[model samples]
Target: MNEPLVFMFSGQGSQYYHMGKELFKENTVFRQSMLEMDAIAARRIGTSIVEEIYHPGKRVSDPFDSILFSHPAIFMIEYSLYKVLEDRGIYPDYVLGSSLGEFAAAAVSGVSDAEDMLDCILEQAIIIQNSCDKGKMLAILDKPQLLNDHPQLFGNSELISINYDSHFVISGEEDHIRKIMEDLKEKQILCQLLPVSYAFHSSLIDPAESAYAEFLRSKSFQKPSIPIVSSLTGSCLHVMDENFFWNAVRKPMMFREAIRYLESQHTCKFIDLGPSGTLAAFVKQLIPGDSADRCCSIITPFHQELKNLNTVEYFRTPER
Candidate 1:
C-alpha cells in the first residue's frame, strides 16, 4: 500500500476503433461511463461518439483522426476508464497527462467534471477545426540531435517533444512535413507521420491559441485532488496557469522529463489509461529495467482488453 501508483493518460495518435469494446460489452460501469460522455458529445455535435468509435464496419487500423471526434473520444475513453478503475478499487497517487490526455488528467483530478472538461475539449476542437490550417506531425525515430544536426532539413518544422533518446516528434505545415519526410527517406532514417489532422505543438495551431485561451479562462479550476505530472512542463502542477489549456496542444510536450520527474518521486505502478497503450510503451523505454517501477497498459486494439483489465485488478489485490 506504500507503493505510489500513477495514472497516465495518452493524447493523439494513440487512438483507433474498438479500443475497449470488450469492456463496453461486459462491464456495466464501463458501459455507462461511455454512454454518459457519448451523450454529452452527441448533443453538441449531433452525432454519437460511441457510434463513431464503434460502428461495425470500422477496423482498428483505420485512422480516426478528426479533431471534433477524436478530441472528445480521447477524453471520453480515458475518463471512462478512470471510472472503471475507481469502481474496481484502483486509484492513483498521482496522475499524468500527455497532450490531449491532459484534459482527462484534469478531469480525473477534479479540476472539472465530465461535462465541463468535455465542453472545453469540444470547444477546443471546434475552434481549431474552424480557425487553424491543416498541418502535419511527424515522429522521427532517430536521436533528437539529428534535428539540430541538420537545421535546413527541419527548418520549417517545430520540435514537439523528445520522447526518449531515440524518439522525437515535430510538426509543421503540410508541404514542409512532406519535404522533411522525403529528405529523411534519402538519409534512411526511420520516421512516421502521425495520424493527426492538425499540426499540434507548433505554430500551425497558433491561430486558435488566443481564442482557445479565452474559452479556457471562463472555466474555474481547483488545485488537483490528486497530484498531476504534466507532460506540458515535464513536472507536477499545483494550480493551472492562465494559458494552460491553450498551450497543451500548441506547445511542445515533455514526455521524457515528465516520467523522470515521476520516477524520482517513487517506484510506482504507472497505469497507461490511453486507448492504445502507447504511453506505456514510452515509459518502458524511459525507465531502467532494474528499477522497481512498474508500468502497465490495459486497453488496446487487440481485443484482449478484458483480459488485460482483469490482470491488473487481480494484481492489485493483496496475496493470501
Candidate 2:
C-alpha cells in the first residue's frame, strides 16, 4: 500500500563536499541536470561550479571551510539533481526547500526560468557576500517562538531564520553572537554557529533583497507546476508573481506550517531533496503519529531505511 509522494530540499549548511557524487557517478539524468546548472552558475559567478563540489579541498584551503563556504555550489547541484529526477518521471506532488533551497524549488516548480533563477541568485549572493561585515548565524534546535521569550537576543544578535517551528537561527555581529551563545548556554539551550558567509532571512539583508526585487521586476516569473510550499510563509503557493519572490527573501521560514500543509494530504510521501535530513525531521515533527513510510529521499545517512516508502524508490529500484 504505497502513498502519494511529495519532495523536500535542504537549504544552506546541508551541502557538504561531494554530496551528489553517488548520483553523479552513475551518469544518471540527475547528474546531467546538475552539470548543466553548474555550467550556468559558473558562467555568471566567474568560478567553476564543478570545483565547488568535486574539488572542495583545493577550492578551499581547508576541507572544513569547504562545507561552510560552499553553499552556492551545493545548492546548484542539489537543484539540478531535483530537475534530473523529475525529468526521469520521479516527480513529487508537493515540494519544500529550506533557505537557499527555496530558489531551487521555485525553479523546479516552473515558477521561474532556470537561467533567470540562477541570475537572481548570483546577484543576491554577490551583494550579500560583499555587504557582510563580521556577522554570523547560529542554528537553534528549539522552536521559533522561543526567541520571543528572550528580548535580550533581539537587542544583542538578530533573530534571522526560523527554520522549523522548533529550529531558530540568529545573526548579527560575531562578538554579539558569541555573547548570545554564552547566554543561551546558561539557559541550557543548545546552539551551533553556522558556517555561512552572512546572515539570511533578516532585515540585515535588505540591500540584497532590494537588488533581488529589481532583478525580479526584470524577469519573467511563472507559476509552479505543483503546489510549491514556501519556507517564508510556511504555506503553499498558488501564484509566483513578483510579490512571492520578494517575500521569499527577508522573511523567516515557516517550516512547521509547510509541514502541516503537507500532512493535510494524509496520503503523501515526502522526498527530502536537498542535502541533509532536517526537513524530514521537521516533517516527522509535523505528523508525529504517522509511521516512517511517509518520508522519502530525505538525504540522511539513515535515509535508506525510509527508501522503501519514498517515490524515489521507483528510480532507485531496477525494473523487472
Candidate 3:
C-alpha cells in the first residue's frame, strides 16, 4: 500500500474467447459479480452475458463483435476483477480506462451506480448499432509519422487514439482503413485491423453523439472517489460533467498523455483489469525505461497461469 496503485481497464479489441473463464469458474467473488452482470445484461440487452462469454461455442457466430454482448461482457469481467481487488484491500488510487473501459472506470470511481452504468452501456451499444455505419479500427505500430505525412490519403478515416509515441489507432470506414493498411504494408509499416464492429472514438460514430450524451446526463453521477485519467483529455479529471461523457466517445484517446501524467507521479503501479494485457503492453512503451518494472498485467489470455493467482497473493509476490 506504500506505492499508489492505478487500475487500467481494457476496452474493445482486448476481449477474446473464454476471457475470464478461469477466474469466473475458480473465484467465487469474481463469478458472483459476473453473475450479477449477467442478470442485468439478460434483462437489458436480452442476452445472457455469461452464456455468450463462457459458451460462445454454442453460438453460430463470434459474440465478441456484437456490441450488445461484447461491450457489457468486457465491463462485467473488468468490474468483477476490480471487485476482487477491492475485497482484497488492493484498491486503486487512480484509474485509467481506454475507450469503452471508461464506463467501468466511472463506476469504480463512484461516478455512477453499477446498475445505472450497465444501463448506460446497453443504451450506448444500442445507439451505436442502430445509428453508426459498420467500420474498422487499425493499430499502426512504430509508424506514427505515416499518419502525419499522408493525412489526405485516408478519405473518411480519423486518427482516434495515440497509445504511445510509436503506436496509434485509426478508425474509419472499412474501405478507407483497408486502403491505408495496404499502403502501410507496402511501406513495411506494421498495421493490423482490430477486432471490432464499429469505429469508436471517431466522427463515424457522430450519429450517436447527442443521444449518448443525453443518456449520460439522465444518469446521476458523483465525483470520483479516486482520480481518473481521462483518455479524451489526456489529463486528470477531478470532476464529472455532461460534457465529459460527450467528449469521451467522440474524441481521440490521448493515452500517451494520460500515461505520462501518471508517470509524473514518481511512484505508481499499474494493473490491467480486462481480458488482455493490451493496455499493459502500451504502458510498457509509454513509461520511462527506468520505471518499466513498475507495471505488470494481472489477467490476460496469453498468461493463463497468472490468472489463477488470487488478487492478494499476486500483490504479495509482484516479482512473479
Candidate 4:
C-alpha cells in the first residue's frame, strides 16, 4: 500500500543561485535532468539557464532576479528534482503549489510532460519580459487586518495574498513599493521586498495575458494523474481551462489556505520539492504542534540535499 504523500513546489522569489548545486555536484540523476532541460531551454529560448545558474563566482547569497533566466531556472530546478525523487521511489499522493509553482506541481503529477511544462513556463517568462511593466512584490510581516486599516499606506499597492494571519504580500509600482518598504521599516512593520522585478498577480502583468494565453491554448493541457491542490483557489483541481496557466500567474496565491484545506481533510506526509525548502517552512509554522503530520524538504540553501534525501530514503518504505 502507498502511504499518502504531498509534493509541493514554490514560485519565483524562492529561487536563488546555487540552489540544488549540492545535488547537481553529486547526483547523476539531478545533473542529467538539469542538462536535458537545459538543452530544451537552449533550443526554445536560445539561452542556457544552466550556464547562468552554475557559472562560477555567483554566490548563493546573490539574488537571481532576471525573469528571463529565473523563470526557467525555477521550473528546471523544480521539475528536475522531481525526476530525482521519482528515481528514489518516493512519490506524491497529492501535489500543491503556489503561483509559478502550480506549473511544477502539474508536471510532477503527469498533468503534462516536464518538457512541455517547461516550454510553457519559458513562454510565460518571455511574454512577461517582452510585454509587462516593471513593478515590485513585497512581503510584510504584519497583521492582515492592519493592512486594511492603513489605506493611505497601502492604497497604491494591491494585496497579493495573505500568506498567514500576520504575513501578506503586496504588488505595485516599484517606486511606490520601495517607498512602502522604507515607510514600513521606519514604522517598524517588518516588511521585505521579494526578489522579483515585476508585480505578479496584479494588473501589471496583464499585458502578457493576450500572448501567453494564446501560447497556452496552442499547447493541449490535461487533467492531473495525481490530484492537484491548487494555490490559486486553495482547492483540489480536476478541470483545467485554456487560460489556467495564464490565470496562475495573474491570480493571487492562496498557499496558506491550500494547506489548511488539505490538513482539514486528513493527516499526510508533505515533501517540499522546491529548491529552497520554502513550503516545508510554511507547513512547519502553519500546522498546530499537537496534531501536525510529517513534512520533509529534500533541498534548501543549506547544502544538505543528500542528507535530506537519505532521511527520506531511510524512512520511506520502498513501493512502486
Q: If both were scored by lDDT, which would come out higher, candidate 1 or candidate 3?
A: 1
Top lDDT model: 1
Residue 45 local lDDT, model 4: 77
Candidate 4: where is the Cα deviation over 4 Å? 1-3, 290-293, 314-320
Q: lDDT (CA) for every model shown?
A: 0.86, 0.65, 0.79, 0.84
lDDT of 3 by residue, 16-114 (tens): 668877777777898999999889889977778888787846432343677778888888888998888888777788899788888899899888877
**Please, what are the lDDT tens digits per residue for candidate 2 over residues 1-62?**
24556677666656555655656665467577777767777776777766666664542222
TM-score ranking, high to low: 1, 4, 3, 2
> Lowest summed lDDT over 10 consecutive residues: which window, candidate 1?
311-320
Residue 147's C-alpha lDDT in candidate 4?
71
Cα displacement (Å) at residue 307, model 2: 7.6
Model 3 compared with the native: what TM-score? 0.91
What overall lDDT, based on C-alpha atoms, would model 2 receive against the true structure? 0.65
What are the runs in model 3 whose C-alpha is more than 4 Å off? 56-63, 303-320
Going through the candidates in the order shown, the clash numbers are 0, 5, 0, 0
Task: Give the lDDT of residue 195 in candidate 4.
Answer: 80
Q: Can you write out model 4's per-residue Cα lDDT over 1-320, one digit (the tens) per residue?
A: 44578889989788888888888889999999999999988886787889898878898788788898998999888988888988877777899978899899998878899999988988888889999889998888888887758777787889888876778889999898988887887778898778889899999899998898778767887778999999998999888777878888898888888998888878767888887887887788788775344787877888899899877774375546
Give model 4 RMSD, 1 decimal. 1.9
TM-score of 4: 0.95
* Residue pairs with backbone overlap in model 4: none
Q: What ordering of candidates by lDDT runs from best to worst? A: 1, 4, 3, 2
RMSD of 1: 1.8
Model 2 TM: 0.83
